Subunit: 223 residues, 4 copies
């Protein structure tokens, strides 16, 4: 079923493989050629999408066209303009190709729209708490660790890395007061970590029960 998506797979990997140092000159050329063949295939797929007028009935596909155009113009612009061996990174527009044919995204679009209001209200909440924490983390250990928690942005780095529970461990609080704070930061992380899921889940629900207005109320109680 997915014709466009399969072609991107070795294409994206070809962009990766071209960036590796100490690669042989003969094999490096082959990876460049594999980029070209797929480009032509995407050029051909542009022609099938563009040249199908006076033969196509009413079908909404405004974003579908955009992907097919970008997939051929960008890798062409770098093909002509960028003379440095760092031209292949432009081919990373083919990431839009697996986003074309999957019924996942037009549904996702109605989730991030019905619950859009609530979602951005969490992001700014994430920022506020992150900042509020990065502030106190600075006041507590600006003296003891002078190059780690030196500035608010140097504490913000830790505020991100603790609230997100990524947890690198390049900037850890040393003071008692600074550690017990980190505790609360590590906890308030979990709280919003699931709050995403909570909101995101309820969005999907109503779309499943919107089609239940014509499958349980007018397809078993009207016929």
């Amino acid at each position: 079923a997915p014709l466009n998506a399969v072609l991107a797979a070795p294409g994206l990997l070809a962009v990766a493989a071209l960036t590796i140092p100490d690669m042989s000159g003969r094999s490096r050329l082959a990876l460049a050629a594999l980029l070209a063949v797929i480009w032509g295939a995407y050029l051909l797929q542009l022609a099938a999408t563009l040249l199908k007028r006076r033969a196509g009935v009413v079908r909404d596909r405004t974003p579908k066209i955009a992907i097919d155009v970008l997939a051929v113009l960008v890798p062409l612009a770098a093909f002509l303009l960028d003379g440095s061996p760092d031209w292949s990174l432009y081919c990373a527009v083919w990431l839009l190709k697996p986003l074309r044919d999957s019924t996942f995204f037009p549904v996702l679009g109605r989730v991030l729209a019905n619950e859009a209001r609530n979602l951005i209200g969490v992001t700014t909440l994430f920022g506020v708490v992150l900042f509020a924490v990065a502030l106190a983390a600075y006041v507590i250990e600006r003296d003891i660790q002078p190059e780690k928690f030196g500035s608010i942005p140097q504490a913000m780095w830790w505020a991100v890395v603790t609230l997100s529970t990524t947890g690198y461990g390049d900037t850890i609080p040393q003071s008692f007061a600074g550690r017990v704070l980190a505790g609360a930061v590590m906890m308030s992380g979990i709280g919003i970590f699931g709050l995403w899921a909570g909101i995101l889940a309820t969005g999907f629900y109503q779309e499943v029960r919107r089609g239940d207005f014509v499958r349980n109320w007018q397809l078993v109680a009207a016929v």
Copy 2:
């Protein structure tokens, strides 16, 4: 899309970043002034916003907005207090009273308040559930490796650190069990980390489901009678 809708919150964005930029060591005195100026311009802008809210007492018949005003009031009194009373280069930190500014004009926290009140009983119980599991794990973490790592697991509050770290799955990697039985425990602790991440998610999912259930008195009881 949202350039003239969150008018009050746009101003806070450069403001908070200015507070941040001011504390950076090795900053030139000329640029350090510019940032100090930028704070004041925004402070005056909120003073202008305070007047537009306070002097205009036009409501109509019935209108309640006491929490809305309380934010604007704090956004001018506190920075001014730091401008006068505090005499160290560490006065700018007080401007972070504008963290309350984005919380004003957004229809989400009156909704969140009703989620956090109708499932309060359940939420509160997860936190004391967390604290118990944390303390019990640290207790066990102590007894095992107090005699192997005396400066990492030497006390309960030294293990409580590893508990918070491991349970939340933040996992810093400064305190790590070395002995067999210590690590086996770490496993159950890390796994029990996943448990709590679920209950936090599941309950909030149940609370937000209860918000869609408010429309069963105007769409399934008055339109299906």
Copy 3:
């Protein structure tokens, strides 16, 4: 909110547990250390007073069910006393930790949670066994790949199972890290299936707490809205 108006017996537990922590700190002054030991005995006295409070008045009405409540109150005085007598080393106060069950008493969360971890238990213990399988199955591949590269981090299944939990749970300490190419590719798949297994737990519980308030409509608009005539007479 049941925090500053309702749970009286759980408030007492707060300083109690912290005193257990405080008493274990090395380099502590024997003057303040005695004061901490003193605080425990005030609380243990308050719990002993609470024991009689729920043992004097044994009934209020006709028949009331409170078997688990007393089981907590009893353990709250017997175990701490057992350590105060039988154990005569500096390591005794640890037994005061049996006050961790005291917040689990005066809460409405746990009888709710109970019916959730029973109506869906079948699926929940199915996730743990899915975790076990994926944890070991991956750990097996880890040892095979990097036993000839880092023979002290990936030289035994137990060393690999360590990396298995550490990664799959998205803890990720950072002392065991795959060095080879092949290991890092799989390592990613561990972090990815780590997203599933971290969300599958969220899945069951989004159904559990849901399937509880949806049991008030089983006799309000289902078994009492549509019925046949002459159903209950004799």
Copy 4:
């Protein structure tokens, strides 16, 4: 409950596979674990007979994989005991990982969840695959010059991309530059959303199964009429 008798046996069986691979082990106790493996292997051989032999439940019932698991539990371990000559044969007995899967009454229901929502799930995989590569691209661009060995290639940047976006956060490949660390800030945030995406999708996955089993206690038992429904 003493009902999963087939799974209890698996527990020490698999642990023995582990214990065998530990270096600095005495030959006396190394033989002892190899012995324990045989004991359980024979128990599954007895169980294999108890599956293929006795028959008394149904007309012609479908349980092909339930037998197939017991098939692999005895053909594979015996192949290692014979065909493999190195002390590294026990690794094959790991096939007993399939044993706790036989009758767990969680995996037949999970299959339908990963079918009625599979369309969506395989959507998030290539969504992850996109952002992962999208981020790695930028990481390389931002710090290929500064850290030429941690971010000296797209593969090396991809290593950070999984590590950050899965919130794992090892702490080996870390962006040092301002921009990369600002990016890392988002790469940590958008990972949390993905940690909700699956968690939200599977929150619907288990939903539209518990309300389909109550299509026989609220749709086919509440709305009942004799001689009024046929096809």
